[PDB]
Design a protein around this ligand. Structure first.
Ligand SMILES: NCc1ccc(NC(=O)c2c(O)ccc[n+]2Cc2nccn2Cc2ccccc2)cc1
Length: 222
């Protein structure tokens, strides 16, 4: 993501890194000891999930690596429009929770007030390179009306818009599937937006997680 800075070391215990073929693919969010949430467009064979990570190159004492035994994409995911861009990953081994690995509670209230948020990820930074160190940026939710004006005809009830008019802080390539956190609850997942990235042009678009309470619950319990 662009125009942010490195996250406080203890502030992102829910952040996951998704790899395939040995390279970063996407972000993700631990929401249950057995389950990571991410974007549907992040699905590829042979996913490796890393928890407890801060710097990608380092072999950190806190990190946990796991394969995936079930990837559950939402049945109504529409790849062309990114509608319902959400996927649940069942870890081959339950997360060993610690001071640096812990689930993030979901925002269940679709009408939630809070528009002050942050995003996290190892996606492309403003210089065009990919960071070793996890980045964080504060951004703000826009209203549904303004979201709709920014992308006429293309925004569904399953999407949220967020951005930053001061610097253009925005998610970028490599950040997909990572958390939009508002009021310290999981509010969204990085899904799509402007390319090149930068939210002064238009806001980033996020999967609206509150819409999926029932589906997440049903899936985790099957
Ligand atoms: N906020 C702007 C933004 C720009 C890029 C991205 N993510 C990506 O480009 C991305 C990624 O991080 C990991 C794997 C694949 N992608 C690209 C992608 N493929 C399908 C959907 N997407 C995200 C996307 C982002 C912008 C326009 C169209 C699609 C997310 C947000």
């Amino acid at each position: 993501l662009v125009h942010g800075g490195p996250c406080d070391k203890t502030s992102h215990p829910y952040q996951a890194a998704l790899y395939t073929s040995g390279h970063l693919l996407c972000g993700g969010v631990l929401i249950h000891p057995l389950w990571v949430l991410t974007a549907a467009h992040c699905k590829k064979p042979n996913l490796q999930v890393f928890l407890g990570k801060h710097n990608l190159g380092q072999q950190e004492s806190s990190q946990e690596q796991s394969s995936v035994v079930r990837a559950v994409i939402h049945p109504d995911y529409d790849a062309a429009s990114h509608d319902q861009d959400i996927m649940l990953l069942r870890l081959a081994r339950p997360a060993k929770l610690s001071e640096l690995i812990q689930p993030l509670p979901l925002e269940r209230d679709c009408s939630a007030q809070t528009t002050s948020c942050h995003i996290l990820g190892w996606g492309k930074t403003a210089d065009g390179d990919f960071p070793d160190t996890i980045q964080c940026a504060y951004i703000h939710l826009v209203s549904r009306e303004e979201c709709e004006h920014a992308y006429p005809g293309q925004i569904t009830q399953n999407m949220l818009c967020a951005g930053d008019e001061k610097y253009g802080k925005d998610s970028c390539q490599g950040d997909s599937g990572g958390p939009l956190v508002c009021g310290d609850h999981l509010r969204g997942l990085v899904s799509w937006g402007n390319i090149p990235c930068g939210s002064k042009e238009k806001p980033g678009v996020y999967t609206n997680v509150c819409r999926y309470t029932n589906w997440i619950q049903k899936t985790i319990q099957a």
